[PDB]
Amino acid sequence: SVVEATWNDVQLEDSLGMEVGYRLIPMVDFQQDGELLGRIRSIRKKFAQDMGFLPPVVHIRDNMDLQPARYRILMKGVEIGSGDAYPGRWLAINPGTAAGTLPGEKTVVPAFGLDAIWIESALKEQAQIQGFTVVEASTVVATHLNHLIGQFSAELFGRQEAQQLLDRVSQEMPKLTEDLVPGVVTLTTLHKVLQNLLAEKVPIRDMRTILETLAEHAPLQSDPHELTAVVRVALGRAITQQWFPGNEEVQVIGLDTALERLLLQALQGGGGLEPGLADRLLAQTQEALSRQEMLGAPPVLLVNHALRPLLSRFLRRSLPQLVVLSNLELSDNRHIRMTATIGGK
Structure with missing residues (x-):
């Protein structure tokens, strides 16, 4: 290599972590916007004022073996959840009661446990008025993280x-x-x-x-x-x-x-x-x-x-x-x- 090996090259296991395909790096970027790191802070905040303790920092790194738009959620190294999230697109989901369908890859999304269709940006006001709930793409990841914390909160503590x-x-x-x-x-x-x-x-x-x-x-x-x-x-x-x-x-x-x-x-x-x-x-x-x-x-x-x-x-x-x-x-x-x-x- 270029630089000599030091103890700083020992990565310890993260209590709570996340791995991200390259198409998602833009929303997890320190330097750029960080559309997701906002939503994660709001989860960790709204967790301590609610369940009474501060969940541990989410160490996010990228990993190129993953599909472009796939995320893994890890606890102490072991994958505890994963899904797909596509940045330009939004997600439309039926609360079980709406009527209609829409154009797209119908997927029973892992974040909500409901059936839902990834749709492009411009169908918004129509999807809302057919009876759907329309979320951004960072919100998909963030909502998925939030269930996993409040289900493992015993072992995260x-x-x-x-x-x-x-x-x-x-x-x-x-x-x-x-x-x-x-x-x-x-x-x-x-x-x-x-x-x-x-x-x-x-x-x-x-x-x-x-x-x-x-x-x-x-x-x-x-x-x-x-x-x-x-x-x-x-x-x-x-x-x-x-x-x-x-x-x-x-x-x-x-x-x-x-x-x-x-x-x-x-x-x-x-x-x-x-x-x-x-x-x-x-x-x-x-x-x-x-x-x-x-x-x-x-x-x-x-x-x-x-x-x-x-x-x-x-x-x-x-x-x-x-x-x-x-x-x-x-x-x-x-x-x-x-x-x-x-x-x-």
């Missing part, structure tokens, strides 16, 4: 990100922090708690309540999978108001009184559930899920407080659409009504 958060908390209630870590709770434990929380879509903007609650219970208990369940109940009014806004009815999914004990039994001296139960749940569970999807009701299962740690650990890795709550985490001022059940069909 690394220990280095937890310390960085602890330092933002520590400048607005320094009392709280000075003696909770590494005093009563080790940063390992705190991180395992906030990660278990981000994992089930539970916002952690209320550090005031999470540290107050830990500092109360940490001396007499230090299993994260146990403190997690107790921070959850501290956040009950906030979790309730997440999936059930207003003070109207609470149309939940529940499980059967016998099935409850069936599992409650398998809990005590069991190291895990047995194979037979397994496949019955997921079918019987997806059964009740499909009813609520027609009725207009949310996908929330409401279980006994000792069953939630493990129905969510078991069901969610198949149907991550599913929210698994606890009767102890709902507000009392709320009217319940189990409008779908998990029993003998």
Whole structure:
């Protein structure tokens, strides 16, 4: 080569990254406009003021093995999503209800999970008025990034990100922090708690309540999978108001009184559930899920407080659409009504 090899030639693995074909470099250009880097900043901003932490910088490099207009989205090196985005063009998408068609390569685009037609620039006002939603091309990439962050936010929330958060908390209630870590709770434990929380879509903007609650219970208990369940109940009014806004009815999914004990039994001296139960749940569970999807009701299962740690650990890795709550985490001022059940069909 021209210049001698130095340690600066060691590229470390990026927490969150992106690779881009040459036809897309113009929208990821530092020097030129950067039509996309604007949209990425707005995602990282609107994520911290919303989910309570700053996602890690998106390291974008180009890679010439890719098609001209293809992007890969990477996490810690592994590709976690990819798609095609064409700069001169726009995208037209039916929300499921519009009528008409249009000229183009019909593609079930990966960013939205809907069917949609890439169209050229001038058909805009017509596509909007036939019933379509018309987006720019950077917006396609950006929207695709945004789903991937809010689906991997548990694994993007690394220990280095937890310390960085602890330092933002520590400048607005320094009392709280000075003696909770590494005093009563080790940063390992705190991180395992906030990660278990981000994992089930539970916002952690209320550090005031999470540290107050830990500092109360940490001396007499230090299993994260146990403190997690107790921070959850501290956040009950906030979790309730997440999936059930207003003070109207609470149309939940529940499980059967016998099935409850069936599992409650398998809990005590069991190291895990047995194979037979397994496949019955997921079918019987997806059964009740499909009813609520027609009725207009949310996908929330409401279980006994000792069953939630493990129905969510078991069901969610198949149907991550599913929210698994606890009767102890709902507000009392709320009217319940189990409008779908998990029993003998």
